[PDB]
mmCIF file of C-alpha atoms and ligand atoms in Angstrom:
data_model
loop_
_atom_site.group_PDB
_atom_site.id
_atom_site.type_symbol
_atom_site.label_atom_id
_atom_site.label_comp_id
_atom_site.label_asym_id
_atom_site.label_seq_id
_atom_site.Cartn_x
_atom_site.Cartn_y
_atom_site.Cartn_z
ATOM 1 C CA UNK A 1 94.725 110.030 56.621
ATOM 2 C CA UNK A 2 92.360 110.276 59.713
ATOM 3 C CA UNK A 3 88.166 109.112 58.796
ATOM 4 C CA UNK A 4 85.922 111.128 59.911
ATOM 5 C CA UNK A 5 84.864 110.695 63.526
ATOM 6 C CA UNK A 6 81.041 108.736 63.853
ATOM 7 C CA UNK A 7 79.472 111.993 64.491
ATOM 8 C CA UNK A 8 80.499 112.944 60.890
ATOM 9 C CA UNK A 9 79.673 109.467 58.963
ATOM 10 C CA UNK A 10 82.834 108.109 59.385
ATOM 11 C CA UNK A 11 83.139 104.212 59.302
ATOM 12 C CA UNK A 12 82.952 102.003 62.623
ATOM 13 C CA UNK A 13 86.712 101.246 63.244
ATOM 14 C CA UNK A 14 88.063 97.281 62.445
ATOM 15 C CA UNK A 15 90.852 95.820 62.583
ATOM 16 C CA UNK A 16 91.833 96.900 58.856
ATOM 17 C CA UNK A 17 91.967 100.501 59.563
ATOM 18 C CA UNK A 18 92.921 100.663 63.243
ATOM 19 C CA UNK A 19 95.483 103.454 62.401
ATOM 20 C CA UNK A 20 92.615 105.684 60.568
ATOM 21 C CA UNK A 21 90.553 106.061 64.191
ATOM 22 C CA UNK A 22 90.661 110.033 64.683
ATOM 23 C CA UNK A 23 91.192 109.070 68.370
ATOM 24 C CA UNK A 24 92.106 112.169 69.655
ATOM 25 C CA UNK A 25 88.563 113.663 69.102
ATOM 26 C CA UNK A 26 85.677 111.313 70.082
ATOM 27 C CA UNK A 27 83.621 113.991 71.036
ATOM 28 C CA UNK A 28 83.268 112.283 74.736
ATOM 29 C CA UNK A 29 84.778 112.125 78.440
ATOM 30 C CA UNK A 30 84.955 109.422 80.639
ATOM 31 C CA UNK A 31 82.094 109.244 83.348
ATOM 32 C CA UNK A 32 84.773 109.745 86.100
ATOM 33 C CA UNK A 33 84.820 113.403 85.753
ATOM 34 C CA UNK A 34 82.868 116.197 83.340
ATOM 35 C CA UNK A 35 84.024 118.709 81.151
ATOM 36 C CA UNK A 36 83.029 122.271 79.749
ATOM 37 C CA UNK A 37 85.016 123.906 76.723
ATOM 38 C CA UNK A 38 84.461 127.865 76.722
ATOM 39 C CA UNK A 39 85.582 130.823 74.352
ATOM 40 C CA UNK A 40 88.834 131.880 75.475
ATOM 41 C CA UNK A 41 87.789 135.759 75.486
ATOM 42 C CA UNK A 42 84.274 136.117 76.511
ATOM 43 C CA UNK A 43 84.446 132.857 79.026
ATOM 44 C CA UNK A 44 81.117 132.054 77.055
ATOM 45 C CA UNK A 45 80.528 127.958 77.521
ATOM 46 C CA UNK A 46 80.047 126.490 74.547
ATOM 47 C CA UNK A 47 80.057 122.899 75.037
ATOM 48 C CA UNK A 48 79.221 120.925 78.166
ATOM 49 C CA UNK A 49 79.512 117.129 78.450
ATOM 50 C CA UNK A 50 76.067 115.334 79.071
ATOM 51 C CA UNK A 51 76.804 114.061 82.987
ATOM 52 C CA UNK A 52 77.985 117.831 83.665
ATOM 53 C CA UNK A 53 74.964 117.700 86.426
ATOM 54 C CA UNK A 54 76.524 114.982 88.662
ATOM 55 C CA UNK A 55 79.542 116.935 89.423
ATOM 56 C CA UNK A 56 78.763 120.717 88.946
ATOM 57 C CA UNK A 57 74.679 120.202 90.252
ATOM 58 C CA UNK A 58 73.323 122.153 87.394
ATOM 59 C CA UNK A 59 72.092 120.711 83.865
ATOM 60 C CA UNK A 60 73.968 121.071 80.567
ATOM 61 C CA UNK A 61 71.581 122.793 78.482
ATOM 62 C CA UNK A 62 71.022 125.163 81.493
ATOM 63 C CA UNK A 63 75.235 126.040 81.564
ATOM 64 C CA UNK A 64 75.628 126.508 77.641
ATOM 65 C CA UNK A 65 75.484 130.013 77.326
ATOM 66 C CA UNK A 66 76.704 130.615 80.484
ATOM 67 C CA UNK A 67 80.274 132.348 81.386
ATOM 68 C CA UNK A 68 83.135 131.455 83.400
ATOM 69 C CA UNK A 69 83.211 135.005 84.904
ATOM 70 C CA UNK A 70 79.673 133.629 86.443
ATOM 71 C CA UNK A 71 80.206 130.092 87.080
ATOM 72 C CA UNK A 72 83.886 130.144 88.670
ATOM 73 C CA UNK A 73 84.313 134.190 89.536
ATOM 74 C CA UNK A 74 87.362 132.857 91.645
ATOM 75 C CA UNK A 75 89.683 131.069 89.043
ATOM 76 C CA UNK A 76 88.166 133.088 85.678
ATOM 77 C CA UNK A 77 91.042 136.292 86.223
ATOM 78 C CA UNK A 78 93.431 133.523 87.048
ATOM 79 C CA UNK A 79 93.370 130.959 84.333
ATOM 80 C CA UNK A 80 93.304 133.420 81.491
ATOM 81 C CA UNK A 81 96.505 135.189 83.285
ATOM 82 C CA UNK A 82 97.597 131.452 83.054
ATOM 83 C CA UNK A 83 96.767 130.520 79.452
ATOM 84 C CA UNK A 84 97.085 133.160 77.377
ATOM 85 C CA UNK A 85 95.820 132.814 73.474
ATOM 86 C CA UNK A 86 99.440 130.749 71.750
ATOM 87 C CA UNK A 87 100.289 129.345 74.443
ATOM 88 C CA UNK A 88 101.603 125.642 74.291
ATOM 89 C CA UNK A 89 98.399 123.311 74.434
ATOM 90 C CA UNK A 90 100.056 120.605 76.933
ATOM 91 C CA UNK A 91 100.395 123.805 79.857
ATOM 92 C CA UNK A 92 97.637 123.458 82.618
ATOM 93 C CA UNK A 93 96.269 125.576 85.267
ATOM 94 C CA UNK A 94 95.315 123.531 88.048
ATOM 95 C CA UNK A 95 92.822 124.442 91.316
ATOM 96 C CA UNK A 96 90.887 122.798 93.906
ATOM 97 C CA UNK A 97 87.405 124.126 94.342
ATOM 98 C CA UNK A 98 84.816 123.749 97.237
ATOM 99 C CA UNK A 99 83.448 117.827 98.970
ATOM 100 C CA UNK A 100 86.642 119.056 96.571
ATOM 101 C CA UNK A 101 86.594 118.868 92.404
ATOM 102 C CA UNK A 102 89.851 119.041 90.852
ATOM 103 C CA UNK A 103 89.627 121.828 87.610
ATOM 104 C CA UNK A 104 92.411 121.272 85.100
ATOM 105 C CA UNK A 105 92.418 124.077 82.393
ATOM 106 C CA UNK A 106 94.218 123.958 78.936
ATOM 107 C CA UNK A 107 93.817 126.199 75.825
ATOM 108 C CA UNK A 108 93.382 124.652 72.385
ATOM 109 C CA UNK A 109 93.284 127.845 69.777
ATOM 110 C CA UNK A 110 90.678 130.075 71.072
ATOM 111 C CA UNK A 111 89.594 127.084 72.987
ATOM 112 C CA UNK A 112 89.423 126.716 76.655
ATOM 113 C CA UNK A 113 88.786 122.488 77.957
ATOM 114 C CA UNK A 114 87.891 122.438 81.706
ATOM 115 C CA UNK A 115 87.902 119.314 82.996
ATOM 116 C CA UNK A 116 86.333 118.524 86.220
ATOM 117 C CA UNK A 117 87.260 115.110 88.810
ATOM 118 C CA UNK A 118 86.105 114.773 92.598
ATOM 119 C CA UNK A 119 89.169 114.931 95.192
ATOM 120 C CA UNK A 120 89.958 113.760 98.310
ATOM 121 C CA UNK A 121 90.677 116.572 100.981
ATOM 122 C CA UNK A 122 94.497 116.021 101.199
ATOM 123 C CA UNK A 123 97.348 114.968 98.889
ATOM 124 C CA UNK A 124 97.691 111.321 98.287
ATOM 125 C CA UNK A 125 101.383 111.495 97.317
ATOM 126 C CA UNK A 126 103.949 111.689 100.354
ATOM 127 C CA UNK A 127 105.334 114.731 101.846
ATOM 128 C CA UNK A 128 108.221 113.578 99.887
ATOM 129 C CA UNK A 129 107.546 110.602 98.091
ATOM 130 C CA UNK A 130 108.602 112.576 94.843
ATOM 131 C CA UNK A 131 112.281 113.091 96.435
ATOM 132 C CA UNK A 132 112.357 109.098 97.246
ATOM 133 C CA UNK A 133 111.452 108.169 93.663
ATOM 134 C CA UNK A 134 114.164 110.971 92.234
ATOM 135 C CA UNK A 135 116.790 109.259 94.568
ATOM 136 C CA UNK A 136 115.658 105.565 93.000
ATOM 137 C CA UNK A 137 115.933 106.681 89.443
ATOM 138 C CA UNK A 138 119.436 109.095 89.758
ATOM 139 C CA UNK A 139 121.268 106.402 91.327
ATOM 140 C CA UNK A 140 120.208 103.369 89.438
ATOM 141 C CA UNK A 141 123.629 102.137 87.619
ATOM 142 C CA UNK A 142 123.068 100.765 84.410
ATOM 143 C CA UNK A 143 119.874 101.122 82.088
ATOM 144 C CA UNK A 144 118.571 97.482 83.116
ATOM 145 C CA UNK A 145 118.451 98.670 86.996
ATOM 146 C CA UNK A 146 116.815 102.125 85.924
ATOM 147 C CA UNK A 147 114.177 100.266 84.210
ATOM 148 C CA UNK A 148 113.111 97.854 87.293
ATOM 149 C CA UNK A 149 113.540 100.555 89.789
ATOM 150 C CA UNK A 150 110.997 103.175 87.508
ATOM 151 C CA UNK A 151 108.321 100.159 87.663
ATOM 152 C CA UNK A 152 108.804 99.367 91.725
ATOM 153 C CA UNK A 153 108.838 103.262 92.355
ATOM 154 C CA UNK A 154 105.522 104.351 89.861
ATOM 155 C CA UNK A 155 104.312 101.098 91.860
ATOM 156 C CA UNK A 156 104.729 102.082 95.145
ATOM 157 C CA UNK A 157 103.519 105.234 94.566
ATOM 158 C CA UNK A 158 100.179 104.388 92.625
ATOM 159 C CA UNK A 159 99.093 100.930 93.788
ATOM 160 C CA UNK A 160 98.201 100.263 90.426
ATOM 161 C CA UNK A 161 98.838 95.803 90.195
ATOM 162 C CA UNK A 162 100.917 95.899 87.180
ATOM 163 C CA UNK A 163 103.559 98.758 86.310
ATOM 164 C CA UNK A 164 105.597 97.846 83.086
ATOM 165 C CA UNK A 165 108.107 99.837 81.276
ATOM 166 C CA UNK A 166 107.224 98.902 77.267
ATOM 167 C CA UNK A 167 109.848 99.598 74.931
ATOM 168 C CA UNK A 168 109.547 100.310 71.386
ATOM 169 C CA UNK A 169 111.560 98.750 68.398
ATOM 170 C CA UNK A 170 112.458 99.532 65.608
ATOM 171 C CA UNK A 171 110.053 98.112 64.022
ATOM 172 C CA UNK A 172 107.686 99.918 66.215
ATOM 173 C CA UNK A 173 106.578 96.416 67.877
ATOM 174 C CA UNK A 174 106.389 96.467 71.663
ATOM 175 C CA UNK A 175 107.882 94.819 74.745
ATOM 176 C CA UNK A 176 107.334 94.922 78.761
ATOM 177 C CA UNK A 177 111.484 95.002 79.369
ATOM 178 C CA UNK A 178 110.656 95.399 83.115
ATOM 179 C CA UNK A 179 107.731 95.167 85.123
ATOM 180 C CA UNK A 180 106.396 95.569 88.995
ATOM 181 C CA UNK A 181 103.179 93.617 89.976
ATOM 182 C CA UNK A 182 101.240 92.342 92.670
ATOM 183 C CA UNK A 183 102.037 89.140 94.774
ATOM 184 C CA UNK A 184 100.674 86.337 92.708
ATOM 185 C CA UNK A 185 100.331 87.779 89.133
ATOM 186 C CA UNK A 186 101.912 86.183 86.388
ATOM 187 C CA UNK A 187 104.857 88.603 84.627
ATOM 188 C CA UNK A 188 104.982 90.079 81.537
ATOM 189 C CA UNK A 189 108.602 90.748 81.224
ATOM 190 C CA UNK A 190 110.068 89.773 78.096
ATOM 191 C CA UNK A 191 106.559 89.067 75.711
ATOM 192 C CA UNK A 192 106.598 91.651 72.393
ATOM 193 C CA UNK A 193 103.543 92.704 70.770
ATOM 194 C CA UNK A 194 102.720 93.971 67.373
ATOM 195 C CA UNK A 195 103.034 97.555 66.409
ATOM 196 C CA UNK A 196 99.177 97.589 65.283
ATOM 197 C CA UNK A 197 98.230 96.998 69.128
ATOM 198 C CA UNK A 198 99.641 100.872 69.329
ATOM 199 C CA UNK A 199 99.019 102.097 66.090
ATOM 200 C CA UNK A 200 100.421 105.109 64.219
ATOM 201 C CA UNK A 201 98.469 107.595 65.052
ATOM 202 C CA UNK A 202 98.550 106.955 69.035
ATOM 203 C CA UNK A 203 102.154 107.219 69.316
ATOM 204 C CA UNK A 204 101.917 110.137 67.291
ATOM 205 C CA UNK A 205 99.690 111.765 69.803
ATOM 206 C CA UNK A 206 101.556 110.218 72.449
ATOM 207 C CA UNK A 207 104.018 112.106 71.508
ATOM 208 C CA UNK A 208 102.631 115.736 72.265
ATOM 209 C CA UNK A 209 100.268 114.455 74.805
ATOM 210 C CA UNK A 210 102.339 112.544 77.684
ATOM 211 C CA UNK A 211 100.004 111.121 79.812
ATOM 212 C CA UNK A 212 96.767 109.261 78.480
ATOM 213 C CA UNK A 213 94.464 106.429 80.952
ATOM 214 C CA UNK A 214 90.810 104.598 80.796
ATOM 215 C CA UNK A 215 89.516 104.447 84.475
ATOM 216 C CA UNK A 216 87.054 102.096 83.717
ATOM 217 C CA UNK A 217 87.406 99.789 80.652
ATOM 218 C CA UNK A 218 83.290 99.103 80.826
ATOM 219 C CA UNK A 219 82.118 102.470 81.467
ATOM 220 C CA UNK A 220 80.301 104.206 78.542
ATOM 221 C CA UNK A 221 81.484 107.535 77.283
ATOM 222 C CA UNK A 222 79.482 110.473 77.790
ATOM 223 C CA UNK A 223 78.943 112.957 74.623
ATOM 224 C CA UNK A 224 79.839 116.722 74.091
ATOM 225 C CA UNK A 225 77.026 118.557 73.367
ATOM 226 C CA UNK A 226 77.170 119.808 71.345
ATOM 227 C CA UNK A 227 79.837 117.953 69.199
ATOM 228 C CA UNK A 228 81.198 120.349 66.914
ATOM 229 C CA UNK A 229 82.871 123.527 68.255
ATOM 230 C CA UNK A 230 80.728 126.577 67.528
ATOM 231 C CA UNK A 231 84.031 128.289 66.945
ATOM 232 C CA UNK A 232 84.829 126.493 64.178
ATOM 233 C CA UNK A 233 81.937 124.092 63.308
ATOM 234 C CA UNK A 234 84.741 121.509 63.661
ATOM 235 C CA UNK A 235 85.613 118.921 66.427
ATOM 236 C CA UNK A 236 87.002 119.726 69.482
ATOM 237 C CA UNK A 237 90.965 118.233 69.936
ATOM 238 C CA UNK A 238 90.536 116.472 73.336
ATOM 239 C CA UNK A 239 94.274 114.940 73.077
ATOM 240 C CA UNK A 240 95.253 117.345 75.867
ATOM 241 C CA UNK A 241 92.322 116.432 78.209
ATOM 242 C CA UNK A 242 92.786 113.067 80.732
ATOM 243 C CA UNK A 243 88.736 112.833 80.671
ATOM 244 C CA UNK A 244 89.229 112.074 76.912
ATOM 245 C CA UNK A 245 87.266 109.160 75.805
ATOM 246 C CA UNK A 246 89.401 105.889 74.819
ATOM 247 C CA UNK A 247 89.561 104.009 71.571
ATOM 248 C CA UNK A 248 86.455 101.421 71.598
ATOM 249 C CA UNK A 249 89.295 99.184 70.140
ATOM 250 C CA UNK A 250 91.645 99.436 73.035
ATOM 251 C CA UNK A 251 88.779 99.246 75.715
ATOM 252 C CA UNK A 252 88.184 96.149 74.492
ATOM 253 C CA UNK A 253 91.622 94.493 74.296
ATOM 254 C CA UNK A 254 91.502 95.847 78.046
ATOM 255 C CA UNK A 255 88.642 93.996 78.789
ATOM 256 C CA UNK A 256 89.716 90.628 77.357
ATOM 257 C CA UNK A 257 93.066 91.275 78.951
ATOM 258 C CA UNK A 258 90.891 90.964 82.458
ATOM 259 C CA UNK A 259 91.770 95.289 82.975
ATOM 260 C CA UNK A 260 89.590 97.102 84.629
ATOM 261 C CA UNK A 261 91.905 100.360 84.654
ATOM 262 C CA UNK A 262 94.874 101.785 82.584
ATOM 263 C CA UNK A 263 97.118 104.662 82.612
ATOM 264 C CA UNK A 264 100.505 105.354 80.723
ATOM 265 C CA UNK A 265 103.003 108.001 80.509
ATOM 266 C CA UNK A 266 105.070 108.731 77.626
ATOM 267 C CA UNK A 267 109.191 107.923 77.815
ATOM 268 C CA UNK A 268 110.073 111.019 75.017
ATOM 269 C CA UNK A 269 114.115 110.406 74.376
ATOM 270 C CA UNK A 270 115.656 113.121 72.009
ATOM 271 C CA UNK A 271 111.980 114.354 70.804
ATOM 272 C CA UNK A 272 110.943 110.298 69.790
ATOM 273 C CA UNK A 273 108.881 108.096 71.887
ATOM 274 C CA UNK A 274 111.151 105.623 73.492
ATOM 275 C CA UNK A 275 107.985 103.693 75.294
ATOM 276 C CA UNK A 276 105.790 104.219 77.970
ATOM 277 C CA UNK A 277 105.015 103.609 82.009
ATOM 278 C CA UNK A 278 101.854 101.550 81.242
ATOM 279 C CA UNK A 279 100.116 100.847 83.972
ATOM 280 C CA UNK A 280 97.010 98.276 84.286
ATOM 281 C CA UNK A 281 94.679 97.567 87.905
ATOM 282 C CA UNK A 282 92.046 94.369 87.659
ATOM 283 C CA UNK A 283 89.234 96.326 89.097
ATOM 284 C CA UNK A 284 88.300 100.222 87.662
ATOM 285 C CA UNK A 285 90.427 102.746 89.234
ATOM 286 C CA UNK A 286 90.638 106.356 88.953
ATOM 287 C CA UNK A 287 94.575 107.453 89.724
ATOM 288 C CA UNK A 288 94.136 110.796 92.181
ATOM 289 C CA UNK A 289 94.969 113.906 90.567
ATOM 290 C CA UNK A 290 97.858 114.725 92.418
ATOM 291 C CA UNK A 291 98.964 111.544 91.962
ATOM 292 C CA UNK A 292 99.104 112.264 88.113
ATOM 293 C CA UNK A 293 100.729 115.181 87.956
ATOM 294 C CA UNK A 294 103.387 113.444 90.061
ATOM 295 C CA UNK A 295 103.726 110.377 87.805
ATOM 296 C CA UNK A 296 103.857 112.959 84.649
ATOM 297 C CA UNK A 297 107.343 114.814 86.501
ATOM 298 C CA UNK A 298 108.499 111.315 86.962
ATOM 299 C CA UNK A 299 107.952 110.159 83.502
ATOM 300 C CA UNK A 300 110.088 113.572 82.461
ATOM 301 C CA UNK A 301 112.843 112.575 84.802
ATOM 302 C CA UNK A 302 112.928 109.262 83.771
ATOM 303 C CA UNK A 303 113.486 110.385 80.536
ATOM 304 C CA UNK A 304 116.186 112.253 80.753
ATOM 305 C CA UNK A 305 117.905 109.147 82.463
ATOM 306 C CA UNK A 306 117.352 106.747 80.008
ATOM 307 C CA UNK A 307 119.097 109.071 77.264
ATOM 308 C CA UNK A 308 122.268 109.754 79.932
ATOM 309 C CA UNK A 309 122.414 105.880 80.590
ATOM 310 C CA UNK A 310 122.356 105.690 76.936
ATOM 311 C CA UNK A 311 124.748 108.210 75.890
ATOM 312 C CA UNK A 312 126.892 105.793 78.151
ATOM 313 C CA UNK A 313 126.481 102.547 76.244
ATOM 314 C CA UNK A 314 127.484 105.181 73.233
HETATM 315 C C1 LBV B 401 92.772 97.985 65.308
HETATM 316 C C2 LBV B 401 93.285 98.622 66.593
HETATM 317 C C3 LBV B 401 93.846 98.032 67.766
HETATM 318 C C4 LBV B 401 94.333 98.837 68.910
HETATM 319 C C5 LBV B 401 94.317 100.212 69.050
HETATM 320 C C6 LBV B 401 94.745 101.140 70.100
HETATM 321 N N1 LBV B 401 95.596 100.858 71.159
HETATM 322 C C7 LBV B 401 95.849 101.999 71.814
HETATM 323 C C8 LBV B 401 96.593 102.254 73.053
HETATM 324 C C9 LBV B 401 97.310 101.342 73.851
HETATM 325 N N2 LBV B 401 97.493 100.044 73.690
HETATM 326 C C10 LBV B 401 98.273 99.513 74.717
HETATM 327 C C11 LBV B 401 98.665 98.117 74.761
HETATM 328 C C12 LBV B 401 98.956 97.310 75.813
HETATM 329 N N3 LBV B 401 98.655 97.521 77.089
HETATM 330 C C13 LBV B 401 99.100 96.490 77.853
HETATM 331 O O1 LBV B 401 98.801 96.420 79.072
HETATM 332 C C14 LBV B 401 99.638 95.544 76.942
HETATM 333 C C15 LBV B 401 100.215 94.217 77.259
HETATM 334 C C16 LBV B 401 100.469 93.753 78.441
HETATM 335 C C17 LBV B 401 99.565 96.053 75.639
HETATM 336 C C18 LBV B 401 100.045 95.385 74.357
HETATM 337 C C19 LBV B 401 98.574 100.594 75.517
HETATM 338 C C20 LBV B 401 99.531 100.516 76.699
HETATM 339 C C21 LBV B 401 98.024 101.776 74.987
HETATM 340 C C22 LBV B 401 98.143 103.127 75.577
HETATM 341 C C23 LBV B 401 96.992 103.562 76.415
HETATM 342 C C24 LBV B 401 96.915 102.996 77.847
HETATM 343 O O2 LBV B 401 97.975 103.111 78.526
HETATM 344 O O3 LBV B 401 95.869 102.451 78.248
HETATM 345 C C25 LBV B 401 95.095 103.086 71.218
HETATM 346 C C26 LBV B 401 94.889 104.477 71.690
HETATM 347 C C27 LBV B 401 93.999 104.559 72.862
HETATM 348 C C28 LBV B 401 93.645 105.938 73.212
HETATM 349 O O4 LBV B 401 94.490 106.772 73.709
HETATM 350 O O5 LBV B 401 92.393 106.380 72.967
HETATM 351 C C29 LBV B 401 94.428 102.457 70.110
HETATM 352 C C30 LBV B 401 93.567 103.181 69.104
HETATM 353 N N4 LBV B 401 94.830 97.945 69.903
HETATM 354 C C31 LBV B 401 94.753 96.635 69.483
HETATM 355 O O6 LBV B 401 95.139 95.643 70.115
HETATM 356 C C32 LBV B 401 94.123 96.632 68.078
HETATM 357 C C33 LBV B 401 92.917 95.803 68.314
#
């Protein structure tokens, strides 16, 4: 059973109770981007995160009170055509809106979580860059071959130095079984880890939630303010929103792992978690948005190849 989160007297985490961390609401973001959450019928905003000036130009306690149907006329009739109250909390409406922020929407209950990230002007992924990386993965011929062609292909298309594909056992300890990396870095293929350095309760969420990353392993998280969902006088879940803040715990084995950026992306085989694409850069790094969603169809297609290439070994 989940403590509390801090904001509700809940115990600093240790290593003794890793798996009790209620990581999936920290009540904080990631300084890459900012995020609002809003009433799902009136478009009232509720809560704002504390930076929401440096990428929306207005202060937080100035937007709390504030509607959607003010602050984004364009997108409000959309998104709630988009995410209607039950729908399935990992659907998102995506825009760009004019420099270029990225606005991913999801619902949560009666909850709407707008999360905001600066864009480039164009597409970093390839005209079709996605078709190149379906080709690599189809016609792979064994499950050995699928694995090293998944890590050169989410590679090539991120840049990220280190792309391993880290397998589960059955004992819920971890291994890198393949691995792509940068000229010069030494491999991880083949080391195993213990099950506690993904505890419980992450691959539970990792479940649900496919797609998770810290941009910056030293950057502080930002609060929601205010903490608790008026709604409810609960906390917010933030396991559907990428500006989520990380688990202090796994910043810091980032950090003494010499990472300055992470991202994964679940491998879900026959509704279990089979492993992840976990990807690590030395230096921070914030994976474009398009280049996300990309990497999230390609973890579903890879996927569904690993259970064909093992139905075949079966
Ligand atoms: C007492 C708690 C501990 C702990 C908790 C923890 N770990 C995660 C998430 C991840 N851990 C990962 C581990 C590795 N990354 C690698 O690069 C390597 C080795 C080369 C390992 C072993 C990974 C991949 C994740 C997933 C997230 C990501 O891709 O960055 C969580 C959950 C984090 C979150 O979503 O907020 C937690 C609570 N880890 C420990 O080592 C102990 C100290």
């Amino acid at each position: 059973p989940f403590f509390p989160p801090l904001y509700l007297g809940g115990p600093e985490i240790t290593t003794e109770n890793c798996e009790r961390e209620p990581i999936h609401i920290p009540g904080s973001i990631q300084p890459h981007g900012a995020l609002l959450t809003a009433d799902g019928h009136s478009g009232e905003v509720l809560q704002m995160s504390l930076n929401a000036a440096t990428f929306l130009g207005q202060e937080p306690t100035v937007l709390r009170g504030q509607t959607l149907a003010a602050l984004l006329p364009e997108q409000w009739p959309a998104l709630q055509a988009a995410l209607p109250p039950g729908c399935p909390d990992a659907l998102q409406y995506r825009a760009t809106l004019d420099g270029h922020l990225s606005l991913t929407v999801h619902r949560v209950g009666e909850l709407l979580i707008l999360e905001f990230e600066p864009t480039e002007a164009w597409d970093s992924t390839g005209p079709h860059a996605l078709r190149n990386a379906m080709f690599a993965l189809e016609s792979a011929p064994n499950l050995r071959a699928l694995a090293e062609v998944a890590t050169q292909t989410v590679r090539e298309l991120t840049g990220f130095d280190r792309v391993m594909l880290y397998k589960f056992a059955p004992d819920a300890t971890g291994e890198v079984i393949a691995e792509a990396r940068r000229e010069g870095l030494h491999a991880f293929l083949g080391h195993r880890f213990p099950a506690s350095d993904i505890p419980a309760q992450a691959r539970a969420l990792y479940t649900r939630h496919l797609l998770r990353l810290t941009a910056d392993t030293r950057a502080a998280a930002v609060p929601l303010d205010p903490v608790l969902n008026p709604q409810t006088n609960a906390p917010t879940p933030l396991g559907g929103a990428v500006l989520r803040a990380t688990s202090p715990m796994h910043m810091q084995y980032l950090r003494n792992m010499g990472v300055g950026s992470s991202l994964s992306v679940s491998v879900v085989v026959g509704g279990q978690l089979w492993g992840l694409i976990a990807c690590t850069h030395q230096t921070p790094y914030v994976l474009p948005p398009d280049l996300r969603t990309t990497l999230e169809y390609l973890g579903r297609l890879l996927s569904l190849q690993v259970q064909v290439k093992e139905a075949l070994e079966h």
